[PDB]
Design a protein around this ligand. Structure first.
Ligand SMILES: CC(=O)N[C@@H]1[C@@H](O)[C@@H](O)[C@@H](CO)O[C@@H]1O
Ligand SMILES: [Ca+2]
Ligand SMILES: [Mn+2]
Length: 242
């Protein structure tokens, strides 16, 4: 079994295991700020930032035909300091081609370029969407499972506990092809669950980059924070299949 795992209970500036792109920054207090916060202490609009694990992950093998099972857990907080103008845009856990650079920001969350369904994206994502775009359901925020498109194959509305820490668990079972995700707000005790069938061998390339991406809106003050406090990941790929 080919395995890879990492766990950050806190983030350290200078850690070479993480690749920061765009506006993402690790504070001295150990917090990963995906999108920029201005010197005045308020979130900046038109900001896009991503953080990738510095090593690619072997998710499936064409020779043996095996597929990896994986699990990721992370804690984040989104604080929307204003109710108007409408806050945007959200954050997303994603897996895609290696050596990837930020895509379009705003409603595309830094991982897509348009709202089309396109096999070539070869991207899988679990989002936490705060702004309702034309391709979105009316309810926000919502959790969504994105397969080669910003238009989710399935969504689950959730209530934001403003500025509070949320715990997320995303697990993929290769045998059943079920991607199941859970979001919990310890502060209120709220629990949300969502699941869908995803055949990763049909969606992702054999080796992928794993990361987190966040973005604020394209209109002035259409923003919020996208802070991550901890992140762990583990993938197990059976080397053979007899
Ligand atoms: C397509 C696109 O990125 N749209 C963005 C949307 O996501 C949101 O950020 C909004 C802020 O009011 O600005 C634009 O409409
Ligand atoms: Ca959206
Ligand atoms: Mn959405």
């Amino acid at each position: 079994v080919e395995t890879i795992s990492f766990s950050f209970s806190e983030f350290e500036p200078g850690n070479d295991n993480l690749t920061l792109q765009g506006a993402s920054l690790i504070t001295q207090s150990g917090v990963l700020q995906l999108t920029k916060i201005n010197q005045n202490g308020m979130p900046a609009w038109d900001s896009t930032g991503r953080t990738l694990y510095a090593k690619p992950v072997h998710i499936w093998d064409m020779t043996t035909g095996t597929v990896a099972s994986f699990e990721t857990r992370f804690s984040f907080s989104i604080e929307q300091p204003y109710t108007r103008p409408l806050p945007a845009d959200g954050l997303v856990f994603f897996m895609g081609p290696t050596k990837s650079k930020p895509a379009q920001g705003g409603g595309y969350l830094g991982i897509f370029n348009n709202s089309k369904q396109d096999n070539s994206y070869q991207t899988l994502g679990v989002e936490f969407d705060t702004f309702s775009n034309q391709w979105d359901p009316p309810q926000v925020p919502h959790i969504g499972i994105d397969v080669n498109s910003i238009r989710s194959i399935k969504t689950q509305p959730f209530q934001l506990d403003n500025g509070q820490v949320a715990n997320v668990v995303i697990k993929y079972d290769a045998s059943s092809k079920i991607l199941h995700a859970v979001l919990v707000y310890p502060s209120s005790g709220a629990i949300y669950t969502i699941a869908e069938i995803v055949d990763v061998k049909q969606v992702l390339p054999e080796w992928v980059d794993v990361g987190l991406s966040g973005a604020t809106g394209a209109q002035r003050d259409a923003a919020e924070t996208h802070d991550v406090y901890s992140w762990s990941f583990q993938a197990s790929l059976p080397e053979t299949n007899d």
